[PDB]
């Protein structure tokens, strides 16, 4: 029983612990969100197929790691799926050929919120898997651990809806112009969606956000968001109605606003957070 990565590198077995680097491609789905499919990433074979058959099984206690350690879901494994983290021992994979075949494993995540997700950085631990290898000749019972690491920066969706971008930068023209914000939302299944903005406001109605510009800031002005002519104050919920697999635009537009008194030239910058909720 030996394994190698999609790039041909061999995966060591039976050390203190083995670290495997894979590419993630999360996608939102109905019921279960996909984290990483390992069938395209890990390949294993058997160098003595005529005289020994190798059995590999996923042991109990396998779970997510790192920033995903507190999440739960399911695991695809050889023709069926089981709850994750594993509370029992999974059935066996059989390796009886010298030809590399995929390790049929994929990890899923149970949605917990409306949109929202945890950001994964390259080289961060994703899951700790416990494997038990046995054979039909020896009576040996060998346990080893694989540590799954990401080699690309992605964001795992923790909810049932996703967005076009997690960070959006827009550029207003010089005072007093305005620009639209290209932000859209879609959900794997029909849902009632609404969002509310957040940040440090600077007025009574709390619709105007403070100028955060670090270098040569302009004073007496702030940033105020509006959708289709209506003004959205912070900490107030805006409803979108039913949303589905077809992307729905939020329709937000960013404008300059005047507060306090005399306005002085300089730079303007605000950072506004958008949050989603069910209805």
């Amino acid at each position: 029983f030996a394994c190698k990565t999609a790039n041909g590198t061999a995966i060591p077995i039976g050390g203190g612990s083995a670290n495997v680097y894979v590419n993630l491609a999360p996608v939102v789905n109905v019921g279960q969100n996909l984290v990483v499919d390992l069938s395209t990433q890990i390949f294993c074979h058997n160098d003595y197929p005529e005289t020994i058959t190798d059995y590999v099984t996923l042991q109990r206690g396998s779970a997510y790691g790192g920033v995903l350690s507190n999440f739960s879901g399911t695991v695809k494994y050889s023709g069926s799926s089981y709850p994750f983290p594993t509370t029992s021992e999974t059935p066996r994979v059989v390796y009886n050929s010298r030809t590399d075949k995929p390790w049929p494993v994929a990890l899923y995540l149970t949605p917990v919120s409306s949109a929202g997700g945890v950001a994964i950085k390259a080289g961060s631990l994703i899951a700790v898997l416990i494997l038990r290898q046995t054979n039909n000749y020896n009576s040996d019972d060998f346990q080893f651990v694989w540590n799954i690491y990401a080699n690309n920066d992605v964001v795992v969706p923790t909810g049932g809806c996703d967005v076009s971008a997690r960070d959006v930068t827009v550029t207003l023209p010089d005072y007093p112009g305005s620009v639209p914000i290209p932000l859209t939302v879609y959900c794997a299944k029909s849902q009632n969606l609404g969002y509310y903005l957040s940040g440090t406001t600077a007025d009574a109605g709390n619709s105007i956000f403070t100028n955060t510009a670090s270098f040569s800031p302009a004073q007496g002005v702030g940033v105020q968001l509006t959708r289709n002519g209506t003004i959205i104050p912070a900490n107030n919920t805006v409803s979108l109605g039913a949303v589905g697999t077809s992307a729905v635009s939020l329709g937000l537009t960013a404008n300059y606003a005047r507060t306090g008194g005399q306005v002085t030239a300089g730079n303007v910058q605000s950072i506004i957070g958008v949050t989603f909720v069910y209805q």
Partner: antibody
Amino acid sequence: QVQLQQSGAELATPGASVKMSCKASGYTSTNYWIHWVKQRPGQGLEWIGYINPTSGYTEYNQNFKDKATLTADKSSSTAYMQLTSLTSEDSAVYYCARGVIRDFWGQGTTLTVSS
Amino acid sequence: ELVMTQTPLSLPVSLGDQASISCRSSQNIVHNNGNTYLEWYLQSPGQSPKLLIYKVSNRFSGVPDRFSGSGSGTDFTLKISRVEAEDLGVYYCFQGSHVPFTFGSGTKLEIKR
């Protein structure tokens, strides 16, 4: 390649103890077992045991269970055999074989136990 | 343990003839998984043993076609279609089914004259 190069020649007094080496291994495949075989001058071959360097699993011939200890170091990829309380009966040629079915043999080590 | 007995003890042959050696086991040597682990090894003058046939009938990668293994149950035979100089040495049969593993008594194949 990483191939079975063994010790040279060893001379020991009765009793005493000696440790032999077989310089090849790798902890990437579970099927590279190392077998040890004994050949006395003029006689045939005897299988002593084998160890799995990747997991440390060992099989022993019960005729040798008081004599031979099998171990392997994962760093140097070197397997070891130790013989204790040597007698004249332990003088022989010792081979190490790689594979589940002993498909690659080593050069051999000659041991003479004399006073 | 189980005893492996080979016959004949010495097999004098001339270069070119057909050579056959026999190895009889003391008990059934089928493994619990159904495979029979009977092996044939060759040791040449001043050289370590090398594998010839690894599952009764299979030929190890790189063994010429001269060698052919056959048998079943308790009696097995190795046959050499035409004898060359490279085939001179001591031949051992090996069982790897029941612990402890055992080798054959050894058969020397030499020149006839």
